[PDB]
Amino acid sequence: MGSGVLPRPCRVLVLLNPRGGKGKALQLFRSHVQPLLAEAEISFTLMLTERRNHARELVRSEELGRWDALVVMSGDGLMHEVVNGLMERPDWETAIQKPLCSLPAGSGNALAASLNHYAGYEQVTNEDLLTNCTLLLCRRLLSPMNLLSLHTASGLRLFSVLSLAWGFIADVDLESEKYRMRFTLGTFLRLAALRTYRGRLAYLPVGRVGSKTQGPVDAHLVPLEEPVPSHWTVVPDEDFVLVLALLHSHLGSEMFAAPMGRCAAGVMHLFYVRAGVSRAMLLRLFLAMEKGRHMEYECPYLVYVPVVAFRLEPKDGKGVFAVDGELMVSEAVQGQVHPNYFWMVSG
């Protein structure tokens, strides 16, 4: 199952956002993570990272040869910054090979949840999740993971380790400003005055061909001013409640969003919900997501397709998106998956 190993013994850089877990991330490290590292012969150094772009800048400038792995203790948002930091480096090709480890603290631990799931553990939460992911780090097994490369109409190129979400899910990620979960509460009250979002979706299903038409090159993508290649699927409906590109099984620690198996190399999940669902059905799909049972409804407004690339354009000025949980505003976004691009600890 594992495709690599950390050395025993090893030393490990821990980037921690102390404002995580309602400001208890460091305490949680001390109580839950530290004692397990001692037993596993894993040395570490803690570097605190709270301000915007801080962890990005550290990782961009780091000498990576002193570390066997970078462990990231916060949420999906920190991993995001770390991965972009590495990819922004002139030596990205080798820098992106540094094993990464996700230890869940805050909220938005979809990555950590997915890995916990891949390893065969129960869908545990909070401190139990933190303990399980630490145990993965202690066991030292490594797996390669897909990376999402994204382009935006303004010309920004960035990377996504987990998800790009638009519409309902994006609106709720933003509408949330809480500790506690805030997603259920946010979903519930956005459900009240449900809205649809007008946009154009195109994607490239795992049925791609023998040929195709500063980081890696996005060979599947053409400029946003050009139409998508003719072998893509353009979605006919232009009214959505949500679109979701997801690289892993979980959208959140208790959201088993992708129960059809784990993604193959270079493949990501694409979900969209067409305009026309009832509030009740949306909520039912939401709550079934906890046990990964939502696909069992065979709801005709919910579409799943495995893809390697997509394009999404609203359609009424700018749209709000969530990239690995962080806010992003754009006129249009497209992306493609790069296969097995970085390594992570997981059993």
Ligand SMILES: Oc1ccc(Nc2nc(-c3ccc(Cl)cc3)cs2)cc1
């Ligand atoms: O981060 C968030 C995750 C889910 C939600 N809310 C909802 N998600 C869904 C949903 C339904 C089906 C799938 Cl495959 C994924 C999400 C319905 S309501 C909001 C924010």
